[PDB]
């Protein structure tokens, strides 16, 4: 069904929808210390999941998401990939965007595997955005079919601002 | 005693001597396809293990081995990072070394678990140093006790030559 470089890929597990509860995870983030959804209590959430920010699409959602999104208070916007935070860390520099809030999953594929964003056949993480309130519970969802195309912003945001 | 990020860090199992063979392995080149010990068949090898080309010591030394061992007729100069191929892929074209062969780990870590050069700490490969026999046997290696520091160039070029 979903695809990615012109072919269908799978995934194992069942994944997230409006109203299950986002599930908590272990990332490493840019300076190499772990972050969990706890660090993020009394926020509100944009996770945004993206093969690797090494590449085109991936980058413009990225960059995209946190400045649409910058203005927005009690709001914050996690970025996961499975890039090293090494390559998240020299992203950031070279888009300005130093405060930007990179995860990777890299340790573990634990965040892929618990979410199956897991892709099977390349262990990358597919391209999905979710919305989450203060309490953790997921009130938008998107899973590109498309992997190699861009995600539906003005959905995520305006789902983001309603909230 | 090996050292990473100034703590010392630990791996699991044996880690391959001199005299022993080189094990198989199958990871993701910068085109994304896989390769194996098969690949590179009747060829002398240069086996650099890095924690992660976007950070100085790594760069210098992928790029120092590859310059120097360049030409070298009948050897190959085969870097393995944890890094995802698309940031050997960016690399390679950020430092002019297009033709040089990157390999990645991310997909199954099995390269780091079955030479034991999986960081128990941090699941990012100790930097070493191997020099294989065309039988792919390891003539010549070198773990670098403080991972944080450069490896020596002079042995591990000189054993290279020598073969």
Same mark, same amino acid.
């Given at each position: 069904?979903?695809?990615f470089l012109?072919?269908?890929?799978?995934?194992?597990?069942?994944?997230?929808?409006?109203?299950?509860? *986002?599930?908590? &995870?272990?990332?490493? %983030?840019?300076?190499?210390?772990?972050?969990?959804?706890?660090? &993020?209590?009394?926020?509100?959430?944009?996770?945004? =999941?993206?093969?690797?920010?090494?590449?085109?699409?991936?980058? %413009?959602? %990225?960059?995209?998401?946190?400045?649409?999104?910058?203005?927005?208070?009690?709001?914050?916007?996690?970025?996961?990939?499975?890039?090293?935070?090494?390559?998240?860390?020299?992203?950031?520099?070279?888009?300005?965007?130093?405060? *930007?809030?990179?995860?990777?999953?890299?340790?573990?594929?634990? &965040?892929?595997?618990?979410?199956?964003?897991?892709?099977?056949?390349?262990?990358?993480?597919?391209?999905?955005?979710?919305?989450?309130? %203060?309490?953790?519970?997921?009130?938008?969802?998107?899973? =590109?079919?498309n992997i190699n195309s861009?995600?539906?912003?003005?959905?995520?945001? *305006? *789902?983001?601002?309603?909230?």
């Amino acid at each position: 069904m979903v695809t990615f470089l012109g072919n269908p890929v799978s995934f194992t597990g069942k994944q997230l929808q409006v109203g299950d509860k *986002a599930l908590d &995870f272990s990332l490493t %983030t840019t300076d190499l210390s772990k972050k969990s959804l706890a660090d &993020f209590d009394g926020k509100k959430k944009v996770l945004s =999941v993206v093969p690797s920010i090494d590449t085109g699409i991936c980058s %413009t959602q %990225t960059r995209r998401f946190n400045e649409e999104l910058a203005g927005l208070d009690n709001t914050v916007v996690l970025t996961v990939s499975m890039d090293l935070p090494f390559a998240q860390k020299r992203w950031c520099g070279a888009e300005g965007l130093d405060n *930007a809030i990179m995860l990777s999953d890299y340790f573990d594929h634990s &965040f892929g595997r618990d979410y199956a964003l897991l892709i099977n056949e390349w262990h990358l993480l597919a391209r999905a955005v979710f919305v989450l309130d %203060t309490d953790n519970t997921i009130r938008y969802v998107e899973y =590109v079919d498309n992997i190699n195309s861009e995600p539906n912003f003005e959905a995520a945001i *305006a *789902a983001a601002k309603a909230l």
